[PDB]
Amino acid sequence: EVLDTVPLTEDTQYKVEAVLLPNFGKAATTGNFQSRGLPYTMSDTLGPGAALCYSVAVINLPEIPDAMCEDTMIVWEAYRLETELLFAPQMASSGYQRANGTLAGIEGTQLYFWACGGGPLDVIGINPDPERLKVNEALEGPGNSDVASLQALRKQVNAANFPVELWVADPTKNDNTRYFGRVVGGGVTPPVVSYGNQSTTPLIDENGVGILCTFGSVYLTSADMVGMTGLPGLPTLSADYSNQRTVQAGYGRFFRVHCRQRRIK
Amino acid sequence: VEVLDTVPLTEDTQYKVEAVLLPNFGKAATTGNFQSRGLPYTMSDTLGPGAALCYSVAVINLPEIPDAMCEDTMIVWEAYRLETELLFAPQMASSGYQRANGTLAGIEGTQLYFWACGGGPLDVIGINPDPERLKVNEALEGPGNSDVASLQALRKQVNAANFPVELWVADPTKNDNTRYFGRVVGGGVTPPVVSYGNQSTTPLIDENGVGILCTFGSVYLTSADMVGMTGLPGLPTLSADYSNQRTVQAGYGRFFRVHCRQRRIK
Amino acid sequence: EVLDTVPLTEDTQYKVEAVLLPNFGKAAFQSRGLPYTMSDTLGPGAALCYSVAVINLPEIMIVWEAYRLETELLFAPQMASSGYQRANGTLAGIEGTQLYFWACGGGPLDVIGINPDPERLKVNEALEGPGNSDVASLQALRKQVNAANFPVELWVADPTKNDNTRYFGRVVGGGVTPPVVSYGNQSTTPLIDENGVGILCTFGSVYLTSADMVGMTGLPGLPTLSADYSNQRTVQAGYGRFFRVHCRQRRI
Amino acid sequence: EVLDTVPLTEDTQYKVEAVLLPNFGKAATTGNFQSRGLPYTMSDTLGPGAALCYSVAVINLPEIPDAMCTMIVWEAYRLETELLFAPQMASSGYQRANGTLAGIEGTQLYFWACGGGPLDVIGINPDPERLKVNEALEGPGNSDVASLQALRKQVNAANFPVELWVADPTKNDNTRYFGRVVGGGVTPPVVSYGNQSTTPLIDENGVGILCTFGSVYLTSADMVGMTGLPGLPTLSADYSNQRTVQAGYGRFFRVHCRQRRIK
Amino acid sequence: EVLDTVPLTEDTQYKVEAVLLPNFGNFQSRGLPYTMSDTLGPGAALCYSVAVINLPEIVWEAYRLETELLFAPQMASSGYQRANGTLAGIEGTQLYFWACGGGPLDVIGINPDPERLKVNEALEGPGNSDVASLQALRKQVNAANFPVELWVADPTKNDNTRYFGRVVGGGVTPPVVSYGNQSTTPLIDENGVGILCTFGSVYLTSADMVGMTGLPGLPTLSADYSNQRTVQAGYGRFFRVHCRQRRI
Incomplete structure (x- = not known):
């Protein structure tokens, strides 16, 4: 039961910034912050340090004095955010394609994903080929379903080792999270990344209610x-160099989250 | 049917329901074949069951409305808005490698993204793009012999798991109590772009403010x-010798949330 | 001189639907043509022509005014139907040069005839010949699409006329370009001008x-996108184009 | 000083239509109206008849009786413009390697302008040392950058190649323009057209193009x-000497004018 | 503390134009050959262009700008590709970036491969981080030798600068450039406040x-000619910045 926002003052408003770093997770409890992984390989197995995992930050919010009074409590409500990808054009850094006599640059399959909520992201585990695709056991294994059935494995992203190839945001949950993802397929598809500091993203639902941070943090x-x-100054996009093809992640993703106070029953 | 006023909004006169429709490479009418990759599609002239993607269907029961009938009027659930999202992850090791470009192959090729929501099954038109040369296994719903959407082209409703998307098109001359949208991309090496999120929404109301009237007590x-x-994981693809392993990649599922209110009709 | 609309009743409003079928016109319906060839010559049966419908409206100076339409392309993904490319070890699909065009008017569409290479491109006698201009000059041939044999490669909507037609077209070039087709039943297209006037159907039909x-x-289950099979390449058209035209009454 | 529009009557409003034809200029005073050029060549030199030049038209507007008191001038406040073009199939040759029609592809430019005088442009040679320009065409001088020293002219003739002359954003105060460039050698073109779109020409103060010289440009x-050429190979080296620029068949304009008082 | 705007007159408003020229830190629109090496070299790597425009002697508040890229189609200028029997044109990786502020642009230095990507000493070196951590080198673009491959606009700063960038990857990707003189870009924040030019200049x-x-009239997009491939920059970027007065 959501009631009214607390009248706006300097004390009833709070914003926080964070830069989430790319994570080729090798462990649950500690990230591996690097914007390029180990060589991905042309194998049937996702390797730790090679596969991009979700990045996570949990940001504690200030205590609200006299929060509980009568049957109502006051919580932080995240109602708007700005987010931006940090990235530079890759030239000398990405190797050369002999067949086209030029720089290879970055290309291939892509994912751009963000979420903001009052708890960790609900995800579904999917192995696109449960018989043939293998996942190193240091990474969160998605179980045996190739479809998003009621039986598919469900977890939350509370750790550094959830590979983005295996875990999808769960639309049947995430009721107190907003998220957005874009996937691009192909092996030579050009990426297009845009950024700036004038765009903003509202987080309010149809009733005007944002993310309710009832656990005291924003996730x-x-x-x-x-x-x-490929590697700098070496050939790539050719059979002999497939063993060096490497995942390119963003340099980081900036968030600015705006909060106000909201009374709930 | 004359549409009267919405019933005043309360907790009891509004309802929402969720479902995830799973991909189906139909091999039979009454039982779906829920898998997100088919059997190898083949380079042949014949659509085979398990290889060809079929429409997914769900029929979701809505709550009984007590005391709904009065003389010449009744109260029904009206679906006025939905959210729908495709579930999908980037495909890397799962989709093989292309020697010629020394890199992962990824997903590419011809695509279809389609959804419908209605008060009964989707009306479709059967079209064989080449009636003389394109063959269809008898386990699948055969579209008949028209290559054009003439008055004579076979018409059916999607009431089973074995309607191939290659052979059956939403019928714009019918579907007056269904909303639908589809996007086709051609080519054999075309990269896909899929987006998803839980903030977008799709109205279902017509120019008179009226949504889908779920008069049978279910939403379709x-x-x-x-x-x-x-291609298959960890193996070469996009080369002549491995064409017999190329497989259709479907979404992992399609989420729907359908929002309903009550409407009196006369 | 356009005056006021007639007050809205059940009798002063009319809507009609049609599905226009693809036409590889041979003289003045199939969704794939005869093989197109790599040659310098457009053939009847190979070259896509405009589809036309003249739909009679009810007897009612008051005339029917079309103020809104819906239009949708009918099409399915092409997989086994379109053959395979050995070089990429996979299905070929549909690709290449494209045209998506619709018009709605109170008479036939005004067009300009253009031969993009008057010295070298040849046109079979069964098709409507565009004349000898490669530019949309005053001298370029002007006709109306009132028959089934106007090839889309040779006739372009005339923006100096069509004062009582609305039209839209999109051309994509290239020979391997992927097509993107979308369709649904929720979109709609107003037909009214700056003064609130739609298409005036003064002949008692909508065009x-x-x-x-x-x-x-290519052909089903066969190799394509290679030299040996160049003589088998065929134009893929849509299966049909749906229209729903909404009409009211207007005093002229 | 821009004052008020004249109250709108039949006499205070005027609209005019034109179709600008493609021009592979070979001389200054006379256009060369064709939609395909001579073969472009794989050479270091822009050839006359091969390089697309700007098309221009200057349209005289009606005399306004008792215009001076302040003076009344025609103000162009809105236009419609559309490209005339058809799909190119048999006309454009065949790519042997892919066993299909080549169609149109490659580098593109779509540009329009409407103003009260000729378009102001900057001359840029992207490689002053190595790119050569036939002497019948307006040479852009020796700057590869849009500096204060770059050659400046107006497009007052039929022989300004679009590869060498860019609209000048430091001028054109009484012109509106828009351009789109696409690179690459095999990039597919996408052209759309219709008779329902419109383009406003009014600035922040609601003032359009003031046609103070009595014409619209x-x-x-x-x-x-x-x-490539009909029925012949293309997109292969053997036939590279036949590759030709494809222009639109024409560009339609309808320009809408009203009367405006100025001081 | 930001107070009210000064009432509008002819005196309290000011606009200024500039064309920033491409800078391979210095003004040329094509660099020296870039090389297929592991090393960014001076004159081959594109650097940020900068202009500091002094304003007339309360501070000036830039609330709106127009910006456009100057560029022409490249045909004979860019060589020929034998494999497709046609002109190569321009293609490859791209960046389109602009910024307007009351001081120099805040940037973060990132080396995408600290172990293998080398940077000539004449260029501003980004330090040793491949991620935008708190440890990554932080600088302002106040010189002509910041390579765009090494320095990214800092979203944690730039509180008095507006910026926008677009990056396109790949080695053969076609570019699409649009320009015109009718588009405009507001610079005001959610409180209606623009760029406060507190040093009396706009940056x-x-x-x-x-x-x-490639080079004119010569083969390109083939191995034997890779040592001739060169970065193509815009001919210039135009700005018109609109200013009013603001009590501070």
């Missing part, structure tokens, strides 16, 4: 796979 | 999401 | 014209 | 890409 | 890499 999740790359 | 959902084709 | 070339295709 | 260029 | 920054190119 951020992201993943930004820009494509694949 | 239909979908198809072919993201492209794929 | 529809369309062309939907989605690209080229 | 139209400028355009529509390079759709390159093409 | 402009830009980068426009349209792709790569």
Whole structure:
């Protein structure tokens, strides 16, 4: 039961910024912050350090004095955010394609994903080919379903080792989270990344209600796979160099989250 | 049917329901074949069951409305808005590698993204794009022999799991109590672009403010999401010798949330 | 001189539907043509022509005014139907040059005839010949699409006329370009001008014209996109183009 | 000083239509109206008849009786413009390697302008040392950058190549223009057209193009890409000496004028 | 503390124009050959362009701007590709960037491969981080030698600068450039406040890499000619900045 916002003052408003760093997770409890992974390989197995995992940040919010009074409590409500991907054009850094006599640049399959909620992101585990695709056991294994059935494995992203190839935001949950993702397929598809500091993203639902941070924190999740790359000053996009193809992630993803106070029953 | 006023909004006169429609490479009418990759599609002239993507359907029962009938009027659920999202992840090791470009192959090729929401099954037109040369296995719903959407082309409703999306098109001359949208992309190496999120919404109301009238007590959902084709994990693809392994890649599922209110009709 | 609309009743409003079928016109319906060839010559049966419908409206100076339409392209993904490309070890699909065009007017569509290469491009006698201009000059041939044999490669909607028609077209070039087709039953298209006046159907009918070339295709289950099979490439059209035209009464 | 519009009557409003034809200029005073050029060549030199030049039209407007008191002038406040073009199939040759029609592809430019005088342009040679320009065409001088020293002219003739002359954003105070460039050698073109779109020409103060010289000046260029010849191979080295620029068939303009008082 | 705008007159409003020229830190629209090496070299790598425009002697508040890229189609200028029997044109990786602020642009230095990507000493080195951590080098673009491959607008700062960038990857990607003199860009924040020019100047920054190119009339997009591939920049980026007065 959501009631009214507390009248706006300096004390009833709070904003916070964070930069989520790319994470080729190798462990649950600690991230591996690097914007390029280990070589991905042309194998049937996702390897730790090679596969891009979700990035997460949990940001504690200030205590609200006299929060509980009568049957109502006051909580922080995140009602708007700005987010931006940090990235530069890749030239000398990404190797050369002999067949086209030029720089290879970044290309291939992509994912651009962000979420903001009052708890960790609900996800579904899907193995696109449960018989043939293998997942190193240091990464969160998605179970045996290739479809998003009631039986598919469900978890929350509370750790550094959830590969983006295996875990999808769960639309049947995430009732107190907003999220947005874009996937691009193909192996040579060019990426297009835009950024700036004038755009903003509202977080309010149809009733004017944002994310209710009833656990005292705001939870951020992201993943930004820009494509694949070769190594600087070496050939790529040729059979002999497939063993060096590497995932290129964004340099980081900036968030600015705006909060106000909201009374709930 | 004359549409009267909405019933005043309360907790009891509004209802929302969720479903996830799973991909189906139909092999039979009454039982779906829920998998997100088919059997190898083949380079042949014949659509085979398990290989060809079929429409997914769900029929979702809505709550009984007590005391709904008065003389010449009744109260029914009206679906006025929906959210729908495709579930999908980037495909990397799962989709093989292309030697010629020394990199992962990923998903590419011909695509279809389709959804429908209505008060009964989706009306479709059967079209064979080449009636003389394109063959269809008898386990699948055969579209008949028209290559054009003439008055004579076969018409059916999608009431089973074995209607291939390659052979059956939403019928714009019918579907007066269904809303639908589809997007087709051609080519054999075309990259897919899929987006999803839980903030977008789709109104279902017509120019008179009237949504889908779920007069039979259920809402009918239909979908198809072919993201492209794929090779097998860790193996070479996009080369002549491995064409017999190319497989259709479907979405993992299609989410719907349907919002309903009550409407009196006369 | 256009005056006021007639007050709205059940009798002063009319809507009609039609599905125009693809036409590879041979003289003045199939969704794939005869093989197109790599040659310098457009053939009847190979080249896509405009589709036309003249739809009679009810007897009622008051005339019917079309103020809004819905239009949708009917099409399915092409997989086994379009053959395979050995070089990429996968299905070929539909690709290449495209045209998506519709018009709605109170008479036939005004067009300009253009031969893009008057010295070298040849046109079979069964098709409506565009004359000898490669530019939309005053001298370029002007006709109306009142028959089934106007090839879309040779006739372009005339923006100096069509004062009582609305039209829209999109051309995509290239030979391997992927097509993108969308359709649904919720979109709609107003037909009214700056002064609130739609199409005035002064002959007692509404005139529809369309062309939907989605690209080229090989034959089912056979190799394509290679030299040996170049003589088998065929134009893929849409299966049909749906129109719903909404009319009211207008005093002239 | 711009004052008020004249109260709208039949006499205080005027609209005019034109179709600007493609021009592969070979001389200054006379256009060369064709929608395909001579073969462009794979050379370091822009050839006359091969390089697309800007198309221009200057349209005289009606005399306004008792215009001076302040003076009344025609103000162009809105226009419609559309490209005339058809799909190119048999006309554009075949790509042997892919066993299909080549169609139109490659580098593109779609440009229009409408103003009260000729378009102001900057001359830029993208490689002053190595790119050569036939002497029948307006040479852009020796700057590869849009500096204060770059050659400046107006498009007052039929021989300004679009590869060498860019609309000048430091001038054109009484012109509106828009351009789109697409690179690459095999990029597919997308052209749309219709008779329902419109383009406003009014600025922040609601003032359009003031036609103080008694005419409206139209400028355009529509390079759709390159093409081979009908029934012949293309997109292969052996036939590269036949690759030709494909222009639009024409560009339609309808320009809407009203009367405006100025001081 | 931001107070009220000063009432509008002829005196309290000011606009200024500039064209920022491409800078391979210095003004040329094609660099030296870029090389297929592991090393960014001076004159081959595109750097940010900068202009500091002094304003007339309360501070000036830039509330609106127009910006456009100057560029022409590249045909004979960009070489020929034998494999497709036609002109190569411009293609490849791209950046289109502009910024307008009351001081220099705040940037973060990032080396995308600290172990292998090398940077010539004449260019501003980004330090050793491949991620935008608190540890990543932080600088302002106040010189002509900041490579756009190494320095990214800092979203954690730039509180008095507006910026926008677009990056396109790949080695053969076609560029699409649009321009015109009717579009405009507001610079005001949610409170109606623009760029406060508290040093009495407006600071402009830009980068426009349209792709790569071969030399005129010569083969390109083939191995033997890779040592001739060169970055193609825009011919210039125009700005018109609109200013009013604001009590501070």
